[PDB]
Amino acid sequence: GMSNKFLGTWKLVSSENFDDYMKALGVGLATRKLGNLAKPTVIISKKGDIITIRTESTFKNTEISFKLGQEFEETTADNRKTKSIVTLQRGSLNQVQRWDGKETTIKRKLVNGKTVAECKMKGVVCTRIYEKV
Ligand SMILES: CCCCCCCCCCCCCCCC(=O)O
Ligand SMILES: [Cl-]
Ligand SMILES: [Mg+2]
Ligand SMILES: [Mg+2]
């Protein structure tokens, strides 16, 4: 049920409050330094019911494949091992990651042709805007 408008190759154009988001995930200073400098490309694709989100950067690459509503094991860019679930709520693609009794959410939604990712951890909100390419 995912909008095919999500599908494509997307480039970060802006990021707000990423440091405090990373810090709340427990990312350490040197890694945050490089994370803040990174300008990743996110590639969303679909094969049958299986959706893939691939993030590419000089510093770290990541890739998850999933079916909506089906928990799956994830390795995040900061090397957290999580149980994740991705869902559709109101045209938004909502990812939840759980590990060690913690939880963070990344909500990706289409806004005037951009993908806007809202990343929440413990009341810290970070917003990152992606342009299709
Ligand atoms: C892949 C760029 C990040 C580089 C590594 C720095 C620490 C990662 C922090 C947690 C993962 C961030 C997820 C951001 C969501 C997004 O914008 O796609
Ligand atoms: Cl980069
Ligand atoms: Mg802040
Ligand atoms: Mg700050």
From Swiss-Prot:
GO terms assigned for molecular function: cholesterol binding; fatty acid binding
Residues annotated as transmembrane: none
Modified residue annotations for N-acetylserine: 3
Record keyword Cell membrane present: no
Family indicated by similarity: Belongs to the calycin superfamily. Fatty-acid binding protein (FABP) family.
Annotated protein name in UniProt: Myelin P2 protein
PROSITE patterns xref list: FABP
Highest taxon above the source species: Eukaryota
Binding site for hexadecanoate: 108, 128-130
Record remark on domains: Forms a beta-barrel structure that accommodates hydrophobic ligands in its interior.
Disease listed for this protein: Charcot-Marie-Tooth disease, demyelinating, type 1G: An autosomal dominant demyelinating form of Charcot-Marie-Tooth disease, a disorder of the peripheral nervous system, characterized by progressive weakness and atrophy, initially of the peroneal muscles and later of the distal muscles of the arms. Charcot-Marie-Tooth disease is classified in two main groups on the basis of electrophysiologic properties and histopathology: primary peripheral demyelinating neuropathies (designated CMT1 when they are dominantly inherited) and primary peripheral axonal neuropathies (CMT2).
Pfam families: Lipocalin (PF00061)
Chief location bin: cytoplasm
Disulphides: 119-126
Record keywords, A-Z: Acetylation, Charcot-Marie-Tooth disease, Cytoplasm, Disease variant, Disulfide bond, Lipid-binding, Neurodegeneration, Neuropathy, Transport
GO biological process, one term: fatty acid transport
Function: May play a role in lipid transport protein in Schwann cells. May bind cholesterol.
Positions that bind (9Z)-octadecenoate: 108, 128-130
Gene3D superfamilies: 2.40.128.20
Complex formation: Monomer.
Subcellular location: Cytoplasm
UniProt-listed CDD domains: FABP8 (cd19469)
Something else known: P2 protein and myelin basic protein together constitute a major fraction of peripheral nervous system myelin protein.
GO cellular component, as recorded: cytosol; extracellular exosome; myelin sheath; nucleus
